[PDB]
Design a protein around this nucleic acid. Structure first.
Ligand SMILES: [Mg+2]
Lengths: 90, 49, 49, 159
RNA sequence: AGCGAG
């Protein structure tokens, strides 16, 4: 019994306190789904599935695939040394 | 140790696109890589490759 | 990395329901190669003056 | 029991054409290892004949199983536990068992529910996999081919 | 990272 509760708590915390720009949970689940589906269609089709394949496998309009992957663009850090002396900030 | 997995016979397919075209359309000049796997269930005794 | 993910999933793999294709995840290997050929310091921008 | 050129059913890959058999002496024992090839994954499976039935390999089922699965497709009054997790586990174990009747019942129940009101992606994946294996098995059950097997599945589900 | 001047 406690395994499912612990899994749920950890997954919810990952959904909430993991991204600098908080995407609410339901969005988080749909994006995680998109990622998994494109991973499996990557295992099968080999080339990264084009938006059409994901839209079909996810029962949403392809533009919705676009926005689901647009909301999930993780920020970057303006304190990265772009060299490999200058941080991206300046 | 009930089952094991193994790899063998790496083999490359023909490159995806010619050199100039790859340099033109910004796609990497790469070739597919195929490796024959082999899964053996040590107890039951099945090989799947 | 692929080896580690294979071993980790193998515990949660239903026996006789698994084949190497559905047991192997190539994503770590391709990710490592791609992150090497780009942003690795020994993979330098070709100097053609 | 095992003859060359026979379209034998191997779980959970469905149809699996035999090619031959090899001595493959291991531990000094020429343990017979018959070779199967499945058109779905294009993989070769070598199994020992002595315990081949133990794994679950079965020959092409006759028309008795065909009419059985049709009648079962016309078996009403099915109820499932309230929780989604329990019923999902039950039907997943039913599929894993490899019994043609159990997977057929799972496929029909899930399809009627999905067509009833539409469910989700995981159930869709389960339904797709189970329907694929069933259509292949039926196609070889009457050698009716995958396309015509899909169509006969589509007419018989109508009831 | 390669590179220039001292
Ligand atoms: Mg000077």
């Amino acid at each position: 019994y406690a395994t499912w509760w612990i899994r749920q708590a950890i997954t919810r915390a990952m959904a909430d306190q993991a991204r600098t720009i908080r995407i609410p949970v339901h969005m988080v689940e749909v994006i995680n789904k998109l990622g998994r589906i494109q991973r499996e269609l990557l295992q099968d089709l080999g080339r990264e599935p084009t938006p059409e394949e994901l839209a079909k496998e996810m029962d949403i309009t392809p533009e919705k695939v676009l926005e689901i992957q647009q909301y999930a663009r993780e920020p970057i850090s303006l304190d990265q040394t772009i060299g490999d002396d200058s941080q991206l900030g300046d | 140790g009930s089952m094991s997995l193994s790899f063998s016979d790496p083999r490359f397919d023909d490159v995806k696109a010619p050199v100039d075209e790859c340099k033109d359309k910004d796609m990497t000049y790469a070739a597919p890589l195929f490796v024959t796997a082999e899964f053996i269930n040590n107890n039951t005794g099945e090989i799947k490759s | 990395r692929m080896e580690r993910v294979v071993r980790e999933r193998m515990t949660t793999q239903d026996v006789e329901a698994i084949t190497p294709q559905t047991l192997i995840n190539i994503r770590p290997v391709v990710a490592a190669i791609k992150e090497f050929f780009g942003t690795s310091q020994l993979s330098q921008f070709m100097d053609q003056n | 029991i095992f003859k060359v050129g026979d379209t034998v059913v191997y779980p959970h890959h469905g149809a699996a054409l035999v090619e031959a058999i090899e001595t493959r002496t291991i531990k000094g024992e020429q343990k017979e290892y018959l070779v199967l090839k499945v058109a779905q994954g294009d993989l070769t499976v070598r199994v020992p004949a002595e315990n081949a039935e133990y794994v679950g390999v079965r020959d092409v089922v006759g028309q008795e199983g065909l009419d059985k699965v049709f009648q079962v497709l016309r078996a009403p009054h099915t109820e499932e536990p309230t929780n989604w997790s329990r019923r999902y586990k039950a039907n997943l174990e039913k599929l894993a068992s490899g019994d043609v009747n159990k997977v057929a019942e799972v496929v029909r129940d899930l399809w009627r529910r999905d067509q009833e009101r539409g469910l989700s992606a995981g159930e869709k994946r389960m339904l797709a996999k189970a329907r694929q294996i069933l259509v292949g098995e039926l196609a070889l059950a009457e050698s009716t081919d995958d396309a015509k097997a899909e169509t006969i599945l589509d007419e018989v589900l109508a009831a």
